[PDB]
Symmetry: C6
Subunit: 65 residues, 6 copies
């Protein structure tokens, strides 16, 4: 209920995000696509990130949902 | 059954919380919204935290249900 | 089958416990309430602990179940 | 299908085991009881270990089913 | 819905990938096969990688679906 | 679909494997038995390894599936 409109807004508005993984590694890019299981994160390559390995998504700017 | 009224009380009363992640990283803010999968944690930005990556939520002050 | 009567006895008899998290962090207090997903652990604050982040619960004294 | 008779043999024969957690911490004792979620591990006290946090169970001696 | 065509494209085109595990370890090779649980990663040997332990798949070069 | 024939071949042909856990610990031995949840790994003792704690299984030699 909450994460779909949130991720959709980040994708639609091309919001740069930081994605922190469960081990603390920080990824950066824009959300190109997502579903209930993964996020496709675009930077220099399109890397697929599994949501089970994500702790938090931090937008680079305030976002109006 | 327990976490829903607990998190709702924290949300309604805007209690500042610390959220500790499974890797030990400490996040801080107010609970803006939540569901069975994620918590929207508001600080300088509205960051989404996946509950599977949360170990403990610690309110900054005693609260009651 | 096993964890419900065990946690219920710890709660009913106000047994001080140590709760070790999957990252090795040690929490301490008394079990105020619990369900199939979380434990409410009371010390100086009532902190909610997600069972998916718990490795072991260690009672401070032998307990008769 | 495999872990149930394996753990039951360890329990019935009171074989001392080492239980390694997903963070690498080593626990030790005898399996007092178990189900599909937890192991009750008996040493100085009866500590409950969540199976989701277990990586490996190592008996102190060869055992057979 | 996203990871299946993504991984299939990586498999069909024999794109070298880096697979980062939830502990940060980097694996490398080509995706020989995959399903909803595991990836068979081919290098000197065919190692099976459990998707629950994967954080991110990073292709060595831009790819398109 | 993939991991059953793969693990069955490793078991049938007594292939020495290394099993890496989600914390990076390396186990070694031969797969004596397995099911959808655990692997029984034989070395000097028969230790049970939970698949939820496994990141990758690496055969010591190329294997024909
Ligand atoms: Cl933007
Ligand atoms: Cl007591
Ligand atoms: Cl062999």
């Amino acid at each position: 209920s909450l994460q779909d409109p949130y991720l959709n807004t980040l994708r639609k508005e091309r919001v740069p995000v930081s994605i922190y993984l469960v081990n603390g590694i920080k990824l950066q890019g824009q959300i190109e696509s997502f579903d209930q299981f993964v996020i496709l994160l675009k930077n220099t390559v399109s890397q697929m990130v599994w949501k089970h390995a994500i702790s938090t998504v931090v937008p680079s700017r305030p976002v109006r949902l």
